[PDB]
């Protein structure tokens, strides 16, 4: 059986590994291949800080809460392993800050030690009057992609750089299954009007003394459109931009100013930080993740497509649960083709 | 009025600053001079991680509980100030780990969001069944010493490098008040059987992924004699060594192995960290801090001595309350000389 995974971000790579880790034994030849037009450092995944944190509001598909819970348990059980440094994984605590009181998130029991802030803590942030504190995880995109690439490579998975024009292009050349993990670009392979870019711009700064994350939220400006500071392993991420439907992959000087002014006000110690660089990325925004089978009938025998895209601002937060689900659907295909 | 401060660690310098800040406007010839045998890089302060945390068990002098509170509030009010970086001051959270239930310490309401560890947090630590979590502060000794020196310079305090044989010697040269801040070496000037060296050895490691402090405690082995990991601004401090009476200012290979093996069991990710260096210091251990006046009968007249030493393993934690106390005592000497 021939498998073609399109996409080399966290979704593409993690899905390919799961599939292989779960079916390499039971299957005759299991030939897996990855096609992507962009790799390891030029993907959306690369731009992400890698904070584990779902949206505050409840998901449209309750199944998404499980996928996140599963990703958190997976990562947590590997956090104190000697290899964690290479994945870019570690424990991190921090603030969520609000102007007004708001209900507890549904994930409050997934994170470590969830609590509300205390008056003395709130005094440090004059502009905010309510908030949370908890311990979570960071999975740094760049590093995790590299780790996944190495794991897959020693599993004899082959990588090809190419832009796919259509599913048929791939089916025509021999694929039995196609796993579609194309992110914000999925619309180019099949009409999906529900799918939109949530453009975001972030800054890398050098401020080793920052040990906590600080996320702020403001309903007037919307999700991830208010200042945030996220320490990485070497560098610190500064953000605050979420523009729906903007496809411009270019650092905008005015957005740069919004980041810098917003973050310095939150944390004045940043005034003396060193700016290492800036990048722009596209959040695959969709009312819910498209994780489903589609059979592509092409005359005699047809080929199987598994869609896995539309993880918006929570692809790292949820990837692993999604990969198991994709692996689960792949399994259904095997028994249908009678090969359990 | 000629003042002589002996000692250029955290106690000497801070005390110097307060006295100068509090009385320069009400005294016409207020002359201050610091004498020290060792400066800014080679003091015990330089070797301290700079974590704010008192001893678990209550202080002998209850006044010490207050001096700690004052220091914490002082430092807290300065954390989000643009200059905090210079001082090496910042917020940090972390774990205190025990093998059994232990009572809440006095200082539970001083630190930010104190709470007990939850079962899931304890699962990350196999050898420990109880613990706390909270947010505290780091004052990097090396950096603060450097800051203090700059403040004193611009205020016109003069520094001299010389080892003082006796108070008598200093009184002879015309000093009206001697401020005695001589650390563990205080007994060389005046017999003090209660003061003993608490030798300590630390390791600087590069492990930027460490965002929390981890302190372990073992009742058998004693205070600061179990592994600990404390992230600094650029570097991570590994320790776990407290030996009473030992005067050897030399790194011990066995002590080294003890630090390293203990800290790797606790946090396996360190196995991959690169070692920068290693230093030894002496905690000025005393049943309680000596902070008091003593009239020294030297000739026809008599010179005032303010002692301020014996801060054990909480010199950084407590330095600011102490310095204000020493300034308070300085105020009395002034009313009595009729010059208030
Ligand atoms: C600024 C920012 C910060 C973020 N922070 C976080 C965070 O802290 N935590 C979190 O959980 N999530 C975060 N996210 C979201 C997360 O990064 C994304 O949801 C995640 O990267 C999506 O995975 P993926 O599908 O993008 O893989 P992708 O990045 O989409 O991989 C895409 C690959 O597929 C290829 N491709 C696309 N179309 C085709 C085609 N037609 N033919 C061939 N190849 C194609 C591309 O060349 C590319 O190489 C953040 C996003 C942004 C923008
Ligand atoms: C390994 C380690 C880690 C620590 N970590 C922390 C921590 O995380 N938090 C915390 O609060 N505390 C900590 N401490 C405790 C803290 O470091 C000390 O209590 C503090 O440094 C004491 O200040 P000081 O009196 O030592 O100044 P000192 O370091 O003692 O300065 C003394 C100066 O006086 C001079 N002097 C002495 N005698 C004479 C003389 N006769 N003539 C002339 N000059 C003389 C010396 O040359 C020296 O320069 C730690 C200690 C150690 C050892
Ligand atoms: N996904 C996120 C998680 C935390 C902070 C920012 C983002 C962001 O997408 O900008
Ligand atoms: N004063 C301290 C605070 C925290 C951890 C260790 C120490 C120490 O003296 O070794």
Swiss-Prot record, chains A, B:
One of its GO terms (molecular function) is glycine oxidase activity. It comes from the Eukaryota. Inhibited by benzoate, crotonate, thiolactomycin, chlorpromazine (CPZ), risperidone, haloperidol, sulpiride, aripiprazole, blonanserin, quetiapine, 4H-furo[3,2-b]pyrrole-5-carboxylic acid, and the substrate analog CF3-D-ala (3,3,3-trifluoro-D-alanine). Inhibited by luvadaxistat, and 6-chloro-1,2-benzisoxazol-3(2H)-one (CBIO). Its cofactor is FAD. SUPFAM superfamilies: FAD-linked reductases, C-terminal domain (SSF54373), Nucleotide-binding domain (SSF51971). It is found in: Peroxisome matrix; Cytoplasm, Cytosol; Presynaptic active zone; Secreted. Residues 1-16 are annotated as: Required for protein stability. This is D-amino-acid oxidase. It comes from Homo sapiens. The gene is DAO.
